[PDB]
Design an enzyme around this catalytic site. Structure first.
Site, PDB file in Angstrom:
ATOM      1  N   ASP A   1      23.710 -42.099  42.264  1.00  0.00           N
ATOM      2  CA  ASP A   1      24.498 -43.175  40.911  1.00  0.00           C
ATOM      3  C   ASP A   1      26.281 -42.014  40.950  1.00  0.00           C
ATOM      4  O   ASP A   1      26.105 -40.663  40.520  1.00  0.00           O
ATOM      5  CB  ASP A   1      23.967 -42.692  39.824  1.00  0.00           C
ATOM      6  CG  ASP A   1      25.340 -44.278  39.586  1.00  0.00           C
ATOM      7  OD1 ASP A   1      26.245 -44.393  39.190  1.00  0.00           O
ATOM      8  OD2 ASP A   1      24.624 -44.251  37.998  1.00  0.00           O
TER       9      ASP A   1
ATOM     10  N   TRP B   1      23.092 -42.245  31.523  1.00  0.00           N
ATOM     11  CA  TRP B   1      23.702 -43.545  31.264  1.00  0.00           C
ATOM     12  C   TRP B   1      23.312 -44.666  30.761  1.00  0.00           C
ATOM     13  O   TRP B   1      22.319 -44.985  30.969  1.00  0.00           O
ATOM     14  CB  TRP B   1      24.683 -44.288  32.774  1.00  0.00           C
ATOM     15  CG  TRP B   1      25.063 -44.808  32.000  1.00  0.00           C
ATOM     16  CD1 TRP B   1      26.862 -45.118  31.156  1.00  0.00           C
ATOM     17  CD2 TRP B   1      25.778 -46.113  33.214  1.00  0.00           C
ATOM     18  NE1 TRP B   1      27.126 -46.587  31.981  1.00  0.00           N
ATOM     19  CE2 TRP B   1      26.826 -47.293  32.669  1.00  0.00           C
ATOM     20  CE3 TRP B   1      24.512 -47.155  33.835  1.00  0.00           C
ATOM     21  CZ2 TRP B   1      26.966 -48.019  33.153  1.00  0.00           C
ATOM     22  CZ3 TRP B   1      25.217 -48.215  34.708  1.00  0.00           C
ATOM     23  CH2 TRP B   1      25.821 -48.955  34.220  1.00  0.00           C
TER      24      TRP B   1
ATOM     25  N   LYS C   1      36.762 -46.465  38.852  1.00  0.00           N
ATOM     26  CA  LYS C   1      37.144 -45.065  37.756  1.00  0.00           C
ATOM     27  C   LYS C   1      38.205 -44.536  38.976  1.00  0.00           C
ATOM     28  O   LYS C   1      39.910 -43.838  38.710  1.00  0.00           O
ATOM     29  CB  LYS C   1      36.042 -44.709  37.414  1.00  0.00           C
ATOM     30  CG  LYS C   1      35.676 -45.289  36.383  1.00  0.00           C
ATOM     31  CD  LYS C   1      34.146 -45.431  36.435  1.00  0.00           C
ATOM     32  CE  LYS C   1      33.567 -45.945  35.564  1.00  0.00           C
ATOM     33  NZ  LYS C   1      31.846 -45.491  35.297  1.00  0.00           N
TER      34      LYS C   1
HETATM   35  C1  LIG Z   1      30.739 -46.523  34.979  1.00  0.00           C
HETATM   36  C2  LIG Z   1      29.771 -46.262  36.247  1.00  0.00           C
HETATM   37  C3  LIG Z   1      28.303 -47.047  36.465  1.00  0.00           C
HETATM   38  C4  LIG Z   1      28.897 -47.845  36.755  1.00  0.00           C
HETATM   39  O1  LIG Z   1      29.912 -48.630  37.243  1.00  0.00           O
HETATM   40  P1  LIG Z   1      31.320 -50.056  37.477  1.00  0.00           P
HETATM   41  O2  LIG Z   1      31.787 -49.966  39.057  1.00  0.00           O
HETATM   42  O3  LIG Z   1      31.746 -50.296  36.695  1.00  0.00           O
HETATM   43  O4  LIG Z   1      30.082 -51.115  37.528  1.00  0.00           O
HETATM   44  C5  LIG Z   1      27.424 -46.719  36.480  1.00  0.00           C
HETATM   45  N1  LIG Z   1      27.142 -45.329  36.437  1.00  0.00           N
HETATM   46  C6  LIG Z   1      28.280 -44.484  36.119  1.00  0.00           C
HETATM   47  C7  LIG Z   1      27.083 -43.097  35.952  1.00  0.00           C
HETATM   48  C8  LIG Z   1      29.244 -45.008  35.094  1.00  0.00           C
HETATM   49  O5  LIG Z   1      29.681 -43.834  34.782  1.00  0.00           O
END
Ligand SMILES: *Cc1c(COP(=O)(O)O)cnc(C)c1O
Ligand SMILES: *Cc1c(COP(=O)(O)O)cnc(C)c1O
EC number: 2.6.1.1
Lengths: 396, 396
Positions: free
Chosen positions: A211, A130, A246
């Site tokens: 993450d 990312w 998400k």
């Molecule tokens: C979307 C995403 C994030 C950041 O998420 P937010 O909750 O929108 O701050 C971090 N890491 C990955 C792999 C993501 O897909």
């Protein structure tokens, strides 16, 4: 004083939304940023959420600052989501959770924390990864190195190349892992490979940072936590930066969490107090709304029931969209074979198009993908599927 | 890895919150943290806010990510509230606004921006000052120096000392100012003193940074913006970190803004792109809720009318508590003469109490004040004023 400031280049992800929202073209198609879209092409507020918000409207009586670490109940729920209802981590009081502004805020909070209270100098991130991971860490004064991951000519996880890469990581280095749904490849380690990495990392002395932004989108809630759970059984310490953006469709409310684990209670408490100081020097306290939403749902049996169903629906549609995509590509007489796409997981697919195929797709046909060729399969619908596949086929 | 981490000392402000929560003595009184309380002693959600919330519940169709800088309407209104309806600043298109998680997040965004894009090395804050200023800036790798401000003896603004101390600020240094309602003295310069300071700063070459967290609590929305406005006419470059936490009773929703001013539209634009990059590496994008609430109310003539009255009530109640406090003090025994308290603005008075005296009121009478002797006048009610003035008098 600003006369000399230089213009920053725009976000490869977030920046594309700007271009998108600017072409006056009729049939534009957005497959860039990681949003979930329904059959009709919208980004709906889930129903469990609307229900939770109603409740809040009736029941809140104050807008009283939250504590640095946020809502207790929120932390509790995140932990069980994360480690199990059962867990020793929870039982021994080994972990501490801070509610942050999204999983982006949690990443930064962890970095600030690490850079100021540990001897960490480098953080290891996959290749590819990312794109924002690098910016966050560099922002804290840490260096980022990459480790091999994705096997391009076979669309796989290059295990030994990944392991050989890692052998260059010193003890006390941070290594970052994606819980599930690797962004942007969609290729995840099996349970064995997770176990192996767990052992190795215990021998090599690395500090693991997970993450976790897609819990529930691969196979399910509990089984998406497996890799993380295996690491947890072997390690004394680890950091989890989790997101509810998400899985709750709560993108703009900024809901995530930073979970800290130490060998024991006394240590974790001590450690956490500093994490708290890092927050205080940042945004002070976290935003209540979205987090009150999540706590309400996770706390109520009915609402949770709905929520899980809404989540399983999200995941299934995506899986449908992925089969539909290759089949259509096929029927549209696509050069190559794209069947590998069926094996990946989550919202994104690493399409395999070149920089200039994605550039073309856009100038020419109003189809928006990320330069790396990452495509948002959840942005696809039966209505946009043919025009889409027709553009791709036209550029290959 | 976390074995040698040392425990962080507690926050002078937020920390008291903790002790308060745990104090079990029945008649406790909280005069610590800056929260507005009503005649009955609660931190209520404003009416205009509950209205706007209802509206959102019904009208929202998506949780879609906001942009880095937030909601355009929000920024637009913020600039008007700040610079006034038809300002040249707005017309020339010199300012750019980013929505942030509270005034705290705005402060930090500015620090990170400054530290990374300019040659700023040090920041000047008053003595005394809001305790967290230091921490935010240091976190950014900036030095914090202090400038003389309050005159303990006659409880006033010592203009010469103020002026003489700044004499050491170099060209290119940042000088931080409190818009109105000096936290924690409650002593603000006059317009005339504001004008003087506005001329020096230009002559002297400083970059002004305004911490604006109490617009509306002194005299009024417009009146309160004078000093800032006077600065705005002379300067080419300026920074503003504002908060909507207190004036909207939106504490836990985290609503604030960071406004960037340059000599021209092209410069500010270029500069703002970097500010945006700084935000992306931090929390990514801001929390929609509370900001939506603010934009809704500011953009609707009816809701706006209700709010301004709600705000007028707050300010008024506070000024009543002021005079009630002195009178009761006197008539209750006090040795000293607390009349200087009547001449301060905002939620907070600098009581002139000793570290030992505040420790005691806490430990012995359950009255919570901050160690510097700052008390929250807005936490005082006609029902708690008696027992309160008694505790104080007993420690004098
Ligand atoms: C979307 C995403 C994030 C950041 O998420 P937010 O909750 O929108 O701050 C971090 N890491 C990955 C792999 C993501 O897909
Ligand atoms: C309250 C306050 C802030 C920060 O407030 P937020 O709660 O983050 O908006 C900053 N400065 C002063 C002087 C304040 O009183």
């Amino acid at each position: 004083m600003f006369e000399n400031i230089t213009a920053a280049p725009a976000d490869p992800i977030l920046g594309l939304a700007d271009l998108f929202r600017a072409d006056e073209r009729p049939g534009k198609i957005n497959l860039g940023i990681g949003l979930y879209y329904d059959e009709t092409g919208k980004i709906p507020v889930l129903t469990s959420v609307k229900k939770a918000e109603q409740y809040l409207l009736e029941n809140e009586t104050t807008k009283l600052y939250l504590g640095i670490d946020g809502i207790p109940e929120f932390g509790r729920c995140t932990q069980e989501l994360l480690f199990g209802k059962g867990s020793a981590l929870i039982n021994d009081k080994r972990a501490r959770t801070a509610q942050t502004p999204g999983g982006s805020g949690a990443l930064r909070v962890a970095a600030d924390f690490l850079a100021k209270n540990t001897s960490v100098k480098r953080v290891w991130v996959s290749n590819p990864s990312w794109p924002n991971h690098k910016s966050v860490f560099n922002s804290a004064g840490l260096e980022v190195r990459e480790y091999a991951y994705y096997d391009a000519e076979n669309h796989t996880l290059d295990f030994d190349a990944l392991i050989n890469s890692l052998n260059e990581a010193q003890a006390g280095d941070v290594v970052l892992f994606h819980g599930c749904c690797h962004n942007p490849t969609g290729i995840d380690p099996t349970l064995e490979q997770w176990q192996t990495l767990a052992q190795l990392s215990v021998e090599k002395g690395w500090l693991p940072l997970f993450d976790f932004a897609y819990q529930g989108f691969a196979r399910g809630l509990e089984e998406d936590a497996e890799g993380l759970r295996a690491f947890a059984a072997m390690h004394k310490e680890l950091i989890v930066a989790s997101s509810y953006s998400k899985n709750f469709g709560l993108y703009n409310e900024r809901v995530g969490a930073c979970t800290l684990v130490a060998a024991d209670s006394e240590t974790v408490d001590r450690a956490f107090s500093q994490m708290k100081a890092a927050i205080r020097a940042n945004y002070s306290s976290p935003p209540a709304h979205g987090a009150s939403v999540v706590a309400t749902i996770l706390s109520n049996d009915a609402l949770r029931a709905i929520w899980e169903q809404e989540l399983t629906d999200m995941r299934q549609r995506i899986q449908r969209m992925r089969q539909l995509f290759v089949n259509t590509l096929q029927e549209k007489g696509a050069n190559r074979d794209f069947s590998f796409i069926i094996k990946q997981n989550g919202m994104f697919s690493f399409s395999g198009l070149t920089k200039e195929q994605v550039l073309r797709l856009r100038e020419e046909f109003g189809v928006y993908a990320v330069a790396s060729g990452r495509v948002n399969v959840a942005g696809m619908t039966p209505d946009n599927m043919a025009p889409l596949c027709e553009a791709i086929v036209a550029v290959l």
